[PDB]
Symmetry: C5
Subunit: 357 residues, 5 copies
């Protein structure tokens, strides 16, 4: 019979939690994972009591200024930090007989900051707008805004850069340039220092005013950030469920999930609220929703089994000290490789740079 | 033949009200419904009197600040809320032999916030611009703005999120997170609690500072919002009758009307006006106009007919208590089965 | 053989509205250019620069209310809608083949003129350094409102006011009370489907009351934008290259009913604050229009009997008369005869079509 | 056997100054002219010495405010004006045989306001930021901005519009509306007066607060402007060397250079400088660089349409004032019309008219 | 034999430092160089101690205003300058048979200003937001902003322009207009002088408030700048690793690296930091990262190598200073060129000439 024919649409196989990923689906199946990340900026979630910690959860604890030009030691519960998660996806392959192997590949992302209309709470005990009578409206969140999000297959590579290289960050509880380099910061740390490099592996530990997304040579992460400074800049946010970001690069690949993990990073700063006291500011952050679309991709084997065959050659032998054949005090003078045959050249050690003339 | 031919345009079959939807038109017919939603924010429309209400209709009543860091009671007639409507559409065809149904499907929307030029009213008893001599102009509406609107085939899903979670919202007349989750707010309700969820179903009841459009796993609603903060930010609004918004998704479907209803939701905050007194800060909201274009779509029934019949009967009949016929104190004695 | 030129469109005649009379052809294009002046408060009529001080192009002042309940806005302080109507020539007076022909606006080049005029920072306005009354004469600033419309009929408006307790003067201005002969209600502060109007007059409908109304089906394209605030730098961009297409979803654009082309406009730039009590004056700028029209073949939607009855109903006066309709009607019986039948035995039998056929009605005897 | 092939690229024929245009290059050649206009807005370039004129060159002299609502004399050296230049291109057609001429034709323009980084000079003698202790930063250039530029084959047509129509401008040194109308300004000059119209043909002469690019009937100029008002608005500028503007219109022509002249007009106002005194404001303007790409276009010869056939159809009407040939004091004695041929009648002074429908010979005397 | 095939992507031969470029690869090979430039914004990097300089590195030292209208003399460590770098690439092939050689060609650039989130340091010793009690937030960096970056095959052409032509810029440590034109600045230099032009060969030497990218008739560099002014304007910065700038032009070429070098120029000013003592207004600048993608392109040699090597060998011959056979005091009295044969003409003193296309016998001299 001449039936009506509804339009063809992707067929849902299964819908649920993270356990749904154990169903073996096939090579051309598409997964849509939905997650969120909370603003971990200052006060942790660990004291749940609305009285014990006052529940500045979602806020910082209060910005204390420096006592002198040389004396700057803020606090850890005052610095907003990077939120991150890692989604552990199921292992895909058993194919170590041909050097192809399939992993997960982030294709699209639908992301959104949640809670913007809550910034319309203009009652409450914040500094009023009419201050000479202490009436009017509770001043809403304003100031500097910082919105970065990243989606990759490895942790976000970071780059250290600070306003003052003499700030005394605590040596415990927070990851600082000194935590990585193991020595106090230099003047090259207020500009780009190629040495101040870390990875976003901890969550709520790397402050966003030290660590910024690193534009490394080759990368497996797509990050999108934007900054708005000032003291009373109005917050501006736009939400909708209608637009996606494409995560594919020029080769049309997009983040390959190595290991099997998918890393999400974010920081959403809306500004600060100033209290009804000495003008104590508290940073506000809002959560970010993620919707990552993953497909399966055939790649060339990223597991070198020669690594295992040579770790077997190496763990049979002791570890040796010796004289340096690596680094800046290398005692290796020269390495040259020959592959084919050529006509005998003239000058064979000939400079190919004109400035060497 | 001899004389010219005008260009072809869509043929209008009928024009009128929601009554004209009862005309059976066919499978390829397109419907356009004009409608508007009013700014339900603060003062309700019930006291129509311009003296006993002062007529803050269209405005909020007046924002009272918290008395301490722990005491904060915000007076429901102060909080702007979500406006919503539901348009009941006619039942459609079906084809039981192929198991296909017909349902309505929103295809595009023309929306607009009406009344922007009314904010050029600079006479009146607002805080003057030259306040030392009380001269100048009456300060216009300024401040934080919030413009969200949604068009779906079912009520908009909401996600609870607040500033201080110690706020004492009134336990009647408003929908709080405590109304939904019968416990008090926790500290996780200041960031994102998957437990703090709701549906924008009543109207003028869900405060816009508690309830935000929730990005659920799978969705049947297209919402578009934007927020502008501050205390003196100039309102900006652009109106035209010339641009449309496509409600179709990646597969090209757009909001299918569950049951048979088409749900419209909006909130359009413009800022505050300040009075010539203690600086109370009434909100202003403007109405939103909707023009939804709908068509009929052939969809596939995803459920067995026996399951739908069982559900119909389970919802038809009242849940009775009764004497125990299952369990350990059963009153059924024997059950026998014969065949032949 | 020497080089030939390129096919530029051929100009038949240029001039004024005189040029629209000459019969041009079926597929000719007309470009009409016009302008609308800012009619906001002070009218053009006292042309002397000393009597009205010539706030022409400006408003007259701003008078704050005296209490919550008593606000009187003083008509010369309210900016209003500018409008015009271009009377185009009749097209099909000759005849028609059950399809007429009307003018159709396809495009519009528009522009607000005089923005560099706002660089006059000399003059007697509130100085920048207000302690020593030196510096710069504060330029025009504040709330801006730019709307324009191009249609084939007057712009429909929707009433909406900041306050419904405002006492607009009952003469010289059109308000919600003028159109709905009652007072304003609280619903007139949100959206009343009842407070509607047409942009009929010019310099009469204030823009703080009357907004372009999104009706169901429309013959007008309007584009507007509003920028609030008190200081709010003015921003304006003028160019002789951008065009607006007036064709709609179906590719038609505004069909000129009758043969009129209606332009509406309001371009508010902000206020000038005087060196006095801080009296504010609205500033507006003229708007230039360039509308491109063509002739469209259009089918008549209405039947001839309807048009003839409309003609006669608008010619003849409307009658009060005695009640031949209603519950106290004075009509006694109405009989209709169509064919012929044998003589019925009852002369006053009743006959009526219930649903399909006429049924004779006995009187209730048995 | 083979050897590589670079990619095709337009071949440069010659490169130099304006004399390079003397080489005859054929019909399909393309010319690119770089040029700049300086801000001639305020103090003139003439006194070169850095003490005599203080060297407010590039700047304006101090803005002086009005003394009362009726006395306003704005002191020519404080009034930014339009920059304009004309480039005389070589004359193309040397053959009068057939009906085709050749014109220059501006196709594209790369333009740029250069010097924006100079506005970061915050050392200097300006109103400080912390003016209490007179310390901080010398306040940078801020305020209201105005950037216009035009490229055409004719001088830019201007329209007059003023903030105040009293505004006693000096009568020599600038071209005001009175300089053109010969009468005092009227109130219609604060709105669009179709009479206050000029052409930008002198440089440093037409103030930007009086004269604005006129959207006229038919045009041979592409102008792009934008305005930002206010008193402390931050200046914004975006310079690059990658984007070009297309000057072709809807028919794809672009400004045809008549008389072989190319006209560049510009005004780039950046805001004000405030002095460490009474808050005396000085306008800052920056130069504008142009790169116009020109080609040759075959146009039709217009001269065969001589002036006697192309008679005074345009606004070539000087006026009518003469002895009365109309009205009741008319001096026309008699008019008669003849069309055909008839047999010789009797009375040669017979009068003959045509009634409401047809012809009738008036009865004879008697 | 039947395993699935991954998709083809560009094959990386090798990666490392600038030494990796010494491997001869082939005509269709593509290189991508990642680099960065630090802000040369007043104070230099060299006094690296955090107390000897206070380390205003990345900042300027402090803006000292003019004492009078006529004398304005700024310190060199208070003027932000252009950052630049040259990247010397290897030599490529040549082909004297058809006089073509291949050059390096910049095709794309991914650029980014790094460190925007460092401007969220609102603790610290700056002018507080509530000044009557010296509490609140230490005011963040704000003010006038200036972001330019350029990528080319030759050094960036500059064009001088100043607010005041009467400023006393120090004669050493900074390249001003007076350094290039040995005279003082004139009033033409406040507007536009086609005379005050320079290149960007040095680094930390050309101040940004004097030297602006010049839109010359010609150019081999692509530059992108934008300026935002004011006193309290908030900084705005957008960063991502996903946006690319196409450096090709109308003909689709893009910057050709003459002299094998590739030139990066930048200045990224974010505003001022105001100190607590007075309103001292140090500038702030952030580093810019560049990822430039280069390819090899065959180009025609513009100048024939014959004339070049001829002039090279002629400069080996002794140069002599004899009696003038050149110029206006020439002792050359006659030069005649005969080529063919013709019937014996009339006037034996005839003059023949060539007028911009072809030979014309000079007009019959009895005019």
């Amino acid at each position: 019979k001449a039936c009506p024919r509804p339009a063809p649409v992707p067929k849902l196989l299964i819908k649920g939690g993270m356990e749904v990923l154990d169903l073996v689906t096939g090579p051309d199946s598409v997964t849509e994972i939905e997650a969120f990340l909370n603003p971990r900026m200052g006060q942790p979630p660990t004291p749940e009591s609305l009285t014990e910690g006052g529940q500045y959860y979602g806020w910082s604890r209060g910005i204390n200024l420096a006592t002198s030009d040389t004396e700057d030691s803020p606090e850890n519960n005052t610095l907003p930090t990077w939120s991150m998660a890692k989604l552990q996806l199921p292992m895909l392959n058993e194919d170590l007989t041909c050097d192809t192997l399939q992993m997960w590949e982030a294709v699209s992302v639908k992301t959104e900051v949640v809670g913007s209309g809550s910034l319309l709470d203009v009652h409450g005990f914040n500094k009023p707008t009419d201050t000479v009578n202490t009436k009017g409206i509770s001043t809403p969140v304003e100031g500097s805004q910082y919105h970065v999000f990243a989606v990759g297959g490895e942790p976000l590579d970071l780059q250290g850069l600070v306003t003052d290289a003499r700030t005394k960050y605590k040596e415990e509880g927070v990851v600082t340039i000194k935590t990585i380099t193991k020595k106090d910061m230099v003047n090259k740390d207020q500009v780009l220092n190629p040495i101040s490099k870390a990875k976003l592996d901890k969550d709520g530990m790397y402050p966003v005013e030290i660590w910024h997304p690193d534009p490394a040579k080759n990368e497996n992460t797509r990050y999108f950030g934007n900054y708005t400074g000032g003291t009373t800049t109005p917050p501006v946010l736009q939400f909708t469920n209608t637009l996606t970001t494409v995560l594919l690069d020029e080769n049309g690949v997009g983040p390959l999930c190595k290991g099997e993990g998918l890393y999400l990073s974010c920081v959403d700063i809306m500004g600060w609220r100033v209290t009804r006291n000495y003008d104590v500011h508290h940073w506000r952050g809002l959560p970010r929703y993620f919707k990552i679309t993953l497909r399966k991709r055939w790649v060339k084997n990223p597991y070198p089994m020669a690594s295992l065959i040579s770790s077997l050659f190496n763990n049979m032998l002791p570890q040796v000290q010796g004289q340096p054949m690596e680094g800046e005090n290398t005692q290796v003078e020269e390495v040259r490789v020959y592959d084919g045959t050529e006509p005998v050249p003239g000058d064979p050690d000939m400079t190919r740079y004109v400035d060497r003339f």
